[model samples]
Target: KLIESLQENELLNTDEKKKIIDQIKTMHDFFKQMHTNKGALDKVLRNYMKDYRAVIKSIGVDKFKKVYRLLESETMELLHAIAENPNFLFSKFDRSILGIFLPFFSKPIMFKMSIREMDSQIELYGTKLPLLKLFVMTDEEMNFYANLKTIEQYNDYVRDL
Candidate 1:
């Protein structure tokens, strides 16, 4: 994630990186928690939006919209692919050998999905991670989003397990 964030011009010093790495040590637990708690997932998404908006606001309007639209389209495409390949992971070619079937597993598509999620989050919120936490803590743009019905409405309307 740090590798990808760097591509977006996020500047992290060594100490910051170490702190982030340490915080991420519980990532697997976070994922498990998210799987079982819809509210936790929504909170996580809201947190991402806080950071995403800041990043795009930094880039200014026109460029931000361009990048957002491009990724949104790609995200839809990858969503379709994932929908189509739900059982593809169960193929016998490498039932016991996970890495052997990677070529057929659509990793690049998955990467695009991840990028699109972040990009769309930025489009809507206009910031990025640590900054997001800061802004939310300070009650800058965070409260407005927290009160917005559009996000919650759309989340219910579009998201499928």
Candidate 2:
């Protein structure tokens, strides 16, 4: 910790010793205290890993998928929200879709609906699929989430939603 000892002996200067002393930190953790330039040119192009690799690979298989995938599939519905009044209705809010009979997922799922009236279409509108595993929390998981982080701190809890 005392690189100053080397400097006091006139062997090195603390001014440049930061370069030799600090080496093991990841790029982001370094920015936690150091300047952006501290990470940009001085200590970068070093640590490496693939980017945009599938998120599934980041989390691994889910036993949560097996049972609740069935539960959510039985209804084929994902949580959704829509503007209730035509005064506020917009085309984006006018769109709708369903998880349907597919247990997994598919494309051509573009869906839209029109109502001749109001408050009648409740439970019919569902979230689009890029959000396929919408249970990202499952809210009920929050009976458990009340017990942990939104994704789980230990993460073993349902492996989460």
Candidate 3:
């Protein structure tokens, strides 16, 4: 019941609530990991729960649902890619300093929030300009990523986007 009473206070119409609730149910199913920490995971989903409602209110419920499906599909692709070949040979700053892959950060959840309002079409992640640039990269960002040695320089390029 983390967000049970928000139904009336917000601006969402009945159909909007129904649409988002359906999406919420499926997204909830994807993260049902028995081995993962219960409190940590649920709380992280609490954020997604909150974000999805905001998304339905502002964005296209139609496009948003497909966006989420694309996200889910991409998740499986990455998970299988790792299953086929495991390697994240990045430097310590990206991992240690960013600590993004940590249990608490919720990268997919993070993606959900950012991509909800994202402008890059076709079908997206949020303000991850590094990733945003990855899609539309040139020799500059390629070289930026090529020589990416520190979080400082990396975020600098992200700022440039």
Candidate 4:
């Protein structure tokens, strides 16, 4: 069903479709494995952070910063589109899981950018970063939450009531 949904979606091209499906499968497998091993998720996250640090060190901070921002921007745009579309079907669990794993999906793009300036031409917009935590908001956090609300709302909107 997931593969078929990806195939039918016009938003992603051939390469992106393949990559997203493959990543989904990989993540599903990892999650399954993590359920059996208590420390698996923590180990994976630690390894991911270690790998990211190595990439940053090797590429230099300036370029790594650029690549990081680019990856973030690309992910944001994709999330924005997904949010904007009211007809996009996703389960509550699916959206919640996506909100958690969105960052990891962009890691491969960072790797590609590590090798070359692939996203040099792409212009990044928006100043807000999406939040993963659900908490009570103060005035400043409220402002930030409002911006983040669109993404969260969209996911929640499509959720089964």
Q: Model 2, residue 108: what's the lDDT?
A: 22
**Residues 77-130 of candidate 3: C-alpha lDDT, one tens digit per residue:** 334432332221222222221232222134554544454334354233333422
Model 2 TM-score, all chains together:
0.16
- The full ranking of all candidates by lDDT, starting with the best, is 4, 3, 1, 2
Q: Which number leads on lDDT? A: 4
Cα error of candidate 3 at position 48, Å? 4.8
User: By TM-score, is 1 or 3 better?
Assistant: 3
Question: Could you give candidate 1's per-residue lDDT for residues 6-91 as a string of tens digits?
Answer: 22222334555444334332332443444456665445443444343454444333443343333333333333332443321121
Candidate achieving the largest TM-score: 3
Steric clashes per prediction: 12, 2, 1, 0
Stretches off by above 4 angstroms in model 4 are 1-57, 89-161
Q: lDDT at 93 for candidate 3?
A: 23
> Which model is ahead, 1 or 2, in terms of TM-score?
1
Q: Candidate 2 at residue 140, lDDT?
A: 56
Which residue pairs clash within candidate 2?
A: 129-132, 142-145
| Top-down TM-score ranking | 3, 4, 1, 2
**lDDT assessment of candidate 3:** 0.38
Model 2 lDDT-worst window of ten: 86-95
| Collision count of model 1 | 12
lDDT of 2 by residue, 1-161 (tens): 32232222322234333322232122123323222243432222122112212322432123213322343343322221111111111111111122232211211211121221111222222223334564244445445424432222322332232
